[PDB]
Design a protein around this ligand. Sequence first.
Ligand SMILES: OC[C@H]1O[C@@H](O)[C@H](O)[C@@H](O)[C@H]1O
Length: 283
Amino acid sequence: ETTKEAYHFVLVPEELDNDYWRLVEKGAKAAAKELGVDLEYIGPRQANIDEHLRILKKAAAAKVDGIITQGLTEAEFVPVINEITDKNIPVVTIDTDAPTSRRVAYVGTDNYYAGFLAGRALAEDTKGKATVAIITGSLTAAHQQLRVRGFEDAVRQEKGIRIVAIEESHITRVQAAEKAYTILKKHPDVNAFYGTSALDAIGVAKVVEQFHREQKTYIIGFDTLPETIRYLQKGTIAATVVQEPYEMGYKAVKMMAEIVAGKDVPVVTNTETKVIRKKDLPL
Ligand SMILES: OC[C@H]1O[C@@H](O)[C@H](O)[C@@H](O)[C@H]1O
């Protein structure tokens, strides 16, 4: 660590203590241990574009050997990824891609297609009939935009599915729940929710269970954090989109070491995504 012996790679999460990003860090740290590189996990305490960009520039100013980060937005992150690359520091994107930038490689879900699968799933389980509200991590983050947009394309040929609300959770359980509650009071006809980040469906499920209505509410969310699996087992959540956070962190560090060695790697490595339901539990 406090040695120049080792390569220094930085992994920047969307939010430092977000549960999903700590899983990504587990994968990255394990790859780093196997390779004998120093992996520094450095990120905003509270998700924030400007703070995220400040940490990227600070790591590049410390002349680290590689930087792994989301290309969180196209407008702000492409020029910064490019300027870092031009200072001879390779950039690997993780979890969210910036495909027009000069990042060397991406490891993460195909986010558009993840949302499309969620849209297919909701249309199948509701037989094409649903009054849908969407809770998304943010309206500006690229992976959130793609998961919403893929969902919308997938349900567009279902005349009986209508989206009546889209709200931001800022990837916390508490804002997801707050938004779910206000959606239900302004739109009492909502009977389906779609969450596009790891804590959204958890926030919705808490609010749905506090009503304990007879007429059920369909919830499809993202990722497989323990609370999500529990709600899926309870039947409160109907489905969720799988990602491979540990694997993208592990593979991003392995790719970075290959790049530092002068070796080619694929431009895009899409880790597995698929919709699972209660019938797919155990795992
Ligand atoms: O809980 C928030 C997290 O949700 C995940 O679905 C997403 O891939 C991560 O980037 C992060 O936004």
